[PDB]
Paper text:
While a 5-residue CDRL3 is conserved for accommodating the N276 glycan in all VRC01-class Abs, both PGV19 and VRC03 show subtle differences in the signature VRC01-class interactions at the CD4bs. PGV19 and VRC03 both have an N58SHC mutation, thus lacking the hydrogen bond formed with the backbone of gp120 R456 by VRC01. PGV19 also lacks the hydrogen bond between CDRH2 W50 and gp120 N280 that exists in the Env complexes with VRC01 and VRC0328, 50. Thus, PGV19 makes multiple stabilizing contacts with its glycoprotein epitope and the surrounding glycan fence in the interprotomer setting of the CD4bs observed on the HIV Env trimer that it lacks on smaller Env immunogens.
Thus, native flexibly linked (NFL) HIV Env trimers were designed to circumvent the requirement for cleavage by substituting the REKR cleavage site at the C-terminus of gp120 with a longer 2xG4S peptide that covalently links gp120 to gp4120. The CD4bs is a difficult epitope to access as it is surrounded by a glycan fence (including N276 in the CD4bs Ab footprint area) that has to be bypassed or accommodated by an incoming antibody. All VRC01-class HIV antibodies isolated to date against the CD4bs from HIV-naïve31 as well as infected persons are kappa chain antibodies, except for the sub-group of PGV19, PGV19b, PGV20, and PGV20b, which are lambda chain antibodies (all isolated from the same donor).
Author numbering:
A (entry chain L): 3 to 9, 11 to 27, 27A, 27B, 28 to 91, 96 to 106, 106A, 107 to 209
B (entry chain H): 1 to 52, 52A, 53 to 82, 82A, 82B, 82C, 83 to 100, 100A, ...
The structure:
């Protein structure tokens, strides 16, 4: 019964604020806690009673409350602040908020497209593998094309994950029958990132 | 000094059971309840219940009553969460947690998390297909070749090249989850394009859950 924004973006040095709103009927909302969590890892308590912070937590994190709405403010945004943030009051938790820190210059993706191997076609299967890497930020739109027609069915795209060099990578797979692959002139993996597009094409030849 | 250590990841079929332990240390075990929470994929945290080491009292959210049993062994300061008759939507990252000394529902101490995957899929070794290099995968002085590690379950697989002798240029991408419940990933290595006719390239795929190891030679085609 706690509502948080889906995401909040900022650039280093700025101050951002994440809200946590309870229902109108909520009598215990004065003991709000805030947590930082790298996805897949244990949360870390940041603020635990509107504004109290444990020992070892940066003073750049501060909490406040105005009626039914609590707020976590991050002063002097740093790249290390890029994580998920959760609020809770008693057993009730918010949905979580993804925080993005735009701390790198824009970087165009490199796209590599592999056709189905003949060894997979012999098994009467066919997979097109599109690998996207070294782009920043991590918001790409991947679109597949059969000849020039958009393809919706059979596509599976991962969410962009960070690499060692702080840039993102992702992979998109197009599953099709061998007859679908051999009956078209070509297939294309179209990657659009920050208004620019990189397109790779393969043909059953 | 305060530590909460949970047991390892689990993979189950709908209708099976699972026991997750939480070994506590660094404080007096009977002074704090041990809470249990879970995080579904792409979702927030969800409180499940707690167990009281002193006396063994428990409390549960409604949707877990009748399927979740929380206990403790106070001689070894370990709490247990028994989840029976699992459903597919019980797939989550499970946490045990302890409140801070303020005891104001501020979870200052968390276990490292336990992955519980509930899927109707069964263990399956991967099919390894070569991603052969061609003129449409070369970038001047370098060429991209790889291996398609297709339709395995569950995670993970590890991929190396030439028995670990090939390190630079290797990029193993995170796996994708097909709608069939099976996983697939790709592993590509950037190599000098002049070496395509002389150097042998072999990806070594290891899938411990199925006890399967595949060595796939990749050559230009």
């Amino acid at each position: 019964a706690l509502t948080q924004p889906a995401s909040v973006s900022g650039s280093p040095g700025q101050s951002i604020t994440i809200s946590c709103t309870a229902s109108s009927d909520f009598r215990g909302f004065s003991s709000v806690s805030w947590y930082q969590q790298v996805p897949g890892r244990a949360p870390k308590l940041l603020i635990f009673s509107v504004n109290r912070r444990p020992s070892g937590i940066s003073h750049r994190f501060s909490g406040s409350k105005s009626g039914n709405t609590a707020s976590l403010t991050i002063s002097g945004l740093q790249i290390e602040d890029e994580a998920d943030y959760h609020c809770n009051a008693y057993e009730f938790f918010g949905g979580g908020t993804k925080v993005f820190v735009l701390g790198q210059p824009k970087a165009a993706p490199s796209v590599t497209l592999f056709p189905p191997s003949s060894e997979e076609l012999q098994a009467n299967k066919a997979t097109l593998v599109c690998l996207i890497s070294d782009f920043y930020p991590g918001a790409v739109t991947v679109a597949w094309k059969a000849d020039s027609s958009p393809v919706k069915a059979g596509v599976e795209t991962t969410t962009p994950s960070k690499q060692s060099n702080n840039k993102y990578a992702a992979s998109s797979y197009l599953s099709l029958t061998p007859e679908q692959w051999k009956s078209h002139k070509s297939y294309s993996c179209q990657v659009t990132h920050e208004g620019s597009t990189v397109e790779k094409t393969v043909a059953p030849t | 000094e305060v530590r909460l250590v949970q047991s390892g990841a689990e993979v189950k079929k709908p209708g099976a059971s699972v026991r997750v332990s939480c070994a506590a240390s660094g404080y007096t075990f009977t002074d704090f309840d041990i809470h249990w929470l879970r995080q579904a994929p792409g979702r927030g945290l969800e409180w499940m219940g707690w167990v009281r080491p002193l006396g063994g009292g428990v409390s549960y959210a409604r949707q877990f009553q009748g399927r979740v049993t929380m206990t403790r062994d106070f001689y070894i300061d370990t709490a247990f969460m028994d989840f029976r008759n699992l459903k597919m939507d019980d797939t989550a990252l499970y946490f045990c947690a302890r409140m801070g000394a303020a005891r104001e529902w501020d979870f200052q101490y968390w276990g490292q998390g336990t992955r519980v995957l509930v899927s109707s899929a069964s263990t399956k070794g991967p099919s390894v297909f070569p991603l052969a290099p061609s003129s449409k995968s070369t970038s001047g002085g370098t060429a991209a070749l790889g291996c398609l590690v297709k339709d395995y379950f569950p995670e993970p697989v590890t991929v190396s090249w030439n028995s670990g002798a090939l390190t630079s240029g290797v990029h193993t991408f995170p796996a994708v989850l097909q709608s069939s419940g099976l996983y697939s990933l790709s592993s590509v290595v950037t190599v000098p394009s002049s070496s395509l006719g002389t150097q042998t390239y072999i990806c070594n795929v290891n899938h411990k859950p199925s006890n399967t190891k595949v060595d796939k030679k990749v050559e230009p085609k």
